[PDB]
Amino acid sequence: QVQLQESGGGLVQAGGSLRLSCAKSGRTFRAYAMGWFRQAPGKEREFVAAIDWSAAITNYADSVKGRFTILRDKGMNTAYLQMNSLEPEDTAVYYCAATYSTIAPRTSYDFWGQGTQVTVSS
Amino acid sequence: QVQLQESGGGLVQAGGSLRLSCAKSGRTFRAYAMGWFRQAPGKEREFVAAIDWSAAITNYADSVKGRFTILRDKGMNTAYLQMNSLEPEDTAVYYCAATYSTIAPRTSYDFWGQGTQVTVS
Amino acid sequence: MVDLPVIQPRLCTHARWPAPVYGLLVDPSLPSNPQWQNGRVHVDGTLLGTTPISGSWVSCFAAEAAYKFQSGTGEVATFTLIEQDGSAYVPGDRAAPLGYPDFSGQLEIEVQTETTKTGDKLKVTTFEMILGPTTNADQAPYQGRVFASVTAAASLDLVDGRVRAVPRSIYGFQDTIPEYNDGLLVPLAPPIGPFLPGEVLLRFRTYMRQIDTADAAAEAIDCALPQEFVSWFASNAFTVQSEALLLRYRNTLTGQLLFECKLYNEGYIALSYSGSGPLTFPTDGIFEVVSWVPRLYQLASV
Amino acid sequence: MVDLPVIQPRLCTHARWPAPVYGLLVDPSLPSNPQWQNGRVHVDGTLLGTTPISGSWVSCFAAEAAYKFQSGTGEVATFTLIEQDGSAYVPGDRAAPLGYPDFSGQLEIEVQTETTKTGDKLKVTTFEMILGPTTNADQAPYQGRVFASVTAAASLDLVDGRVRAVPRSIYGFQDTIPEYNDGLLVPLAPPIGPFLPGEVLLRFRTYMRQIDTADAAAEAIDCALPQEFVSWFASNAFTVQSEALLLRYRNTLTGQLLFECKLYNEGYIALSYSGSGPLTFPTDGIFEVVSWVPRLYQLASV
């Protein structure tokens, strides 16, 4: 069956960098987007970034534009989130997800990582 | 504009035959079914029969199966309803209709003819 | 001298629908003298009708497409035809642009489209187009204008631009020439023929992707020559010595004769056959040229 | 002696995607020795890789299809491959059945389908199929098994049966060989080459129906020879006398030489070009055979 495995979560100082990676394994039957979501303690799961299968289309949340980049190679099973100028409000469990699509959606993702903790200390 | 011109209604005795015909005129931009609906006084417009553009598919209302035959030439603009063993319950205004389709649908027709009165003794 | 390409019919391309040749047969219950406009070439390489050299042109057209939404109809495409190489289409001594379909029914076509309505921006859109008969869309490919449409609840917001329409499927197929000029006369390649008494047309058969009833047969379409034979005559410069060529169709491994036939120099093949129903042949033989022969040359019966 | 079909490139069929040849060029910035599996033939007529004789086979496949619905994924097609003439496919000394795509990305395909639902019973259904890269669908066309799928809320109630998949569009195109054997090795036609120093590959270019963003370029795909050249060599029995044929590409009308090139007997054309960027040529010229030349023949620079 389809699995996502993410890593690269840690503690970093405000204004620091961190890089998350995700890999998909198992059989998929057509093109799939890969995205990053986050969930801070108590609050609701929010979209961070997504990239299409062709790796030509990206969607970002307004709060991460000019700070976070999502990376992927055309048709390939790994996605990366390069998180720069990190701020304490970026603290959360970051989840990898994938979904059947020719674009970079913001919602309705079918496949989910186990999540990785990012902590930014002021 | 799509127009449907009907011929062949009128008065007939119980157990007799009539042939309705319907000629589509005006430019259409893909395949269209030709069909017959009918409306008795006080009742809703109900489905009678329909034939797809290819003239290979027919649907009939249950109440007319075995009595009525719809005919059409492949891709052509004229449909015929051969109505045999007519009965008083068959008295209504018969409407030719047409609708873009690759089948013979029983509902949701876009184009409508004037209607012709059919009266059985 | 005139030779033929060494290619088994089952490895050849059909000349009227873009698919493999699957069948080889005679059937005297079928119209004897069809007026096909594709798959028509003289032994001397003279193309007739709308016959293209490239198999990829067959049952396709290119155009400047203009799109509008018309509520109760849907999305309407008006196609201003060009030749498939991008050169201007000019009304001339043939029915339509080269490769334009030469049969009737409703074709599903596919075209590259661009939309502004948000999702994919470049994509491929299917339209429905009536080739024929008349009393439908008033098609005029002779004059460079044809019409297609598809059911849409609202505008697809398509951008005008260049397309090459390729065939997806046929609905209500009929093997009679389409509406080329809104009911007006067009220049046609002549009916195939004539045949000696007892001679019948050899048919190269393929099957068309169709919309039909659950129990319909495969939808057969026939042509006079596979596309490899068409391009072979057009890309060669043969000198014609007589009215016909005797061919022998032989088993590729043993040389066993399956049948002899005549390639009339006007681009059609006759067998001498007296049965009333269809007769099929192996598709894994080779045609060999034997000799120039006169019109009246009497073939061995099959 | 060797001759070529008298056909302008612009009137020829592409050998890797089923469309007209639109462009003729060299481009040193591109991969020098591509490992294309279609459009590969020797001047002596030996077909290489998955190269079919018929243009209709290019970027297509035939199969027994088995369909299932899988909540969350949609309708899934399992294709057990056959050769496109209906004969059995056996893993052998090439990557796949004849004409199987030799590029990567997601191919929208069309197949005849039969449903038990109400409405159209025989119709054409579009599926999405990953060609490559690996880490996607675990395709094994070398073994005779590939998978496609399409979004559906419910079972499409499709009947299992024989299909011929034809290409509608390409998404995420990349000109590298697809996943032939679930990431394992397969027998391959070797890279195109070699070239003398200064020599570059002549490319016959077409454009692919694509799914992309608004401001994408046409999606270019190149081949070594047009399909009419492939069938010409395969249908002739030419004797090879040395490493290459000297060709002249001439203006049909003025007789003016546009360039000279070497057709290597292994089925690719070299020009001497030292620019770093692409150089396009008119597509309305004619290739003529001058003579057999040795491997080390020095072409005039273009």
Could you tell me the residue ranges of all domains in chain D? 8-57+172-294, 58-171
Taking CA–CA distances from B59, the nearest residue in chain D reads: D119
Cβ atoms within 10 Å of C164's Cβ, excluding its own = 22
Nearest chain B Cα distance for residue C160, angstroms: 19
Instruction: Indicate the burial class of C249 (C-beta count within 10 angstroms; 0-12, 13-18, 19 or more).
Output: buried
CA distance C8 to A56: 45
Are D84 and C20 contacting, i.e. CB atoms less than 8 angstroms apart? yes
| Token pair of C63 as six digits | 């155009």
Neighbours of D72 (CB within 10 A): 8
Partnered with residue A78 across adjacent β-strands are A23
Nearest CA in chain D to B102: D120
Residues D216, D219, D223, CA angle at the centre, nearest 5°? Answer: 160
What does the buried/exposed string (b/e) look like for A54-82 if buried means 16 or more CB atoms within 10 Å of the residue's CB? bbbbebbbeebeeebbbebebbbbebbbe
Q: What is the stated resolution of the deposited model, in angstroms?
A: 2.2
Chain-chain contact of D124 with C112 (C-beta, under 8 angstroms): no
- DSSP calls for C78-120: EEEEE-TTSPBP---SSSSSTT---SEEEEEEEEEEEB-SSS-
State the Cα–Cα distance between residues D227 and D229, nearest whole angstrom. 5
The CA distance from D124 to D44, in Å, is 40
Residue C151, both tokens:
């059911």
Beta strand ranges found along D242-296 (DSSP E): 244-251, 257-264, 268-272, 279-281, 285-293
| Cα(D275)–Cα(D280) distance, integer angstroms | 12
Mark yes or no for CB contact C54/D13 under 8 Å: yes
Rounded-to-integer distance, Cα C27 and Cα C175, Å: 15
- Yes or no: say if C227 and C18 are a contact pair by the CB < 8 Å rule: no
Rg (CA), chain A: 14
Burial per residue of B94-116, b for 16 or more beta-carbon CB atoms within 10 angstroms, e otherwise: bbbbbbbbbbbbbeebebbbebb
Method used to solve the structure: X-ray
Q: Which residues of D touch B103 (CB under 8 A)?
A: 119-120
Q: What is the DSSP letter of A72?
A: E
C-alpha–C-alpha distance, residues C41 and C39, integer Å: 7
Min Cα separation B34/chain D (Å): 16
Rounded Cα–Cα distance for residues B108 and A45 (Å): 44
CB D200 within 8 A of CB D271: yes
Put simply, whether D132 touches A (Cβ < 8 Å) is: yes
Return the sign of the alpha-carbon dihedral for residues D11, D17, D23, D26.
negative
CA distance D109 to D290: 43
Residue C128, chain D, CB below 8 Å: the answer is: no
CB neighbours of C59 closer than 8 A, spacing ≥ 6? Answer: C16, C17, C18, C38, C99, C101, C107, C167
Residue B71, CB half-sphere, CA atoms under 13 Å: how many? 9
The domain C58-171 having CATH identifier 2.40.30.120: the answer here is yes
The amino acid present at C202, given as its one-letter code, is: L
Residue of D nearest to B103 (CA): D119
Whether residue D157 contacts residue D117, with contact meaning beta carbons closer than 8 Å, is answered with yes
Establish whether chain B is in contact with chain C, requiring a minimum of 3 CB pairs below 8 angstroms: yes
The answer for D 165-194 residues in CB contact with C (under 8 A) is: 166, 168-169
- Among candidate residues C58, C57, C39, the one with its CA nearest the CA of residue C49: C39
Report which DSSP code applies to B62: G
Residues C281 and C24 sit within 8 Å (Cβ to Cβ):
yes
Contact A14, A118 (CB under 8 A): no
d(CA B26, CA B4): 9
Locate all alpha helices (DSSP H) within C102-260, ordered by sequence: 227-235
Beta strands (DSSP E) in chain C are: 23-26, 61-70, 74-82, 104-114, 122-132, 145-150, 161-174, 199-201, 203-208, 210-211, 219-223, 244-251, 257-264, 269-272, 279-280, 285-293
Chain C residues near residue A102 by CB distance under 8 angstroms? 120
Computed over its alpha carbons, how large is the radius of gyration of chain D? 21
Distance from CA of C245 to the nearest CA of B (A): 39
* CATH 3.30.420.40, domain D8-57+172-294, yes or no: no
Find, among C270, D172, D95, the residue nearest to A76 by Cα. Answer: D172
- Type of residue found at C261: C
Burial class (CB in 10 A: 0-12, 13-18, 19+), B89: exposed
Length in residues, chain C? 302
> Given B31, B75, B77, which is nearest C174 (Cβ)?
B75
Q: Write the CB contacts of A112 (distance below 8 Å, at least 6 apart in sequence).
A: A4, A95, A96, A97
Tell me the C-alpha distance between C145 and D246, whole Å: 45
D221 and D17 in contact (C-beta within 8 Å)? yes
Nearest residue in B to D123, CA atom:
B102
Instruction: C89-94: list long-range contacts, CB under 8 Å, 24+ apart.
Output: C89/C144, C91/C142, C91/C143, C91/C144, C92/C187, C93/C187, C94/C37, C94/C49, C94/C50, C94/C186, C94/C187, C94/C189
Which residues 21-50 on chain C approach chain B with CB closer than 8 angstroms? none
